[PDB]
Design a protein around this ligand. Structure first.
Ligand code: CL
Ligand code: CL
Length: 162
């Protein structure tokens, strides 16, 4: 198991524009297109992202390409962030995948606001961090996915994904 297979399980794959859990125009493997209500603003962003007139539909390869870019960008955002970097560096390889997952889903600002959990993770207080992470809108909105990520932080194994 690795970050790619992990996110592929959490996000699914959709080849036609769809609305995410928050109601936003998304495509592929969790690629947010726009927070605007306009399907046209979404279609525009889509064509811009792919480099072609897509009419709202992409191929698997195109999906995977967006996905490759997004994971990369997620990692780089963590590495560039003064609050996230130290925590991330402190983690083992499995837990690092959990961190990437959160950033991919909620953005760097979002995660960055989990100050207390971040401190707990850095100190390696696993059960404590797990409890604190659950006290969040994130957990309340996407409980099954949150639980999976949280279990990964708690255990340091891929059990939630097996
Ligand atoms: Cl893009
Ligand atoms: Cl969920």
């Amino acid at each position: 198991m690795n970050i790619f297979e992990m996110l592929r399980i959490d996000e699914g794959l959709r080849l036609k524009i769809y609305k995410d859990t928050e109601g936003y125009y998304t495509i592929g493997i969790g690629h947010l297109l726009t927070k605007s209500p306009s399907l046209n603003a979404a279609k525009s962003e889509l064509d811009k992202a792919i480099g072609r007139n897509t009419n709202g539909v992409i191929t698997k390869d195109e999906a995977e390409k967006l996905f490759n870019q997004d994971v990369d960008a997620a990692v780089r955002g963590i590495l560039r962030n003064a609050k996230l970097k130290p925590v991330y560096d402190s983690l083992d390889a499995v837990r690092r995948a959990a961190a990437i997952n959160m950033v991919f889903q909620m953005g760097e600002t979002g995660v960055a606001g989990f100050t207390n959990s971040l401190r707990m993770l850095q100190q390696k207080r696993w059960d404590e961090a797990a409890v604190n992470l659950a006290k969040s809108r994130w957990y309340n909105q996407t409980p099954n996915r949150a639980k999976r990520v949280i279990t990964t932080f708690r255990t340091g194994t891929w059990d939630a994904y097996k």
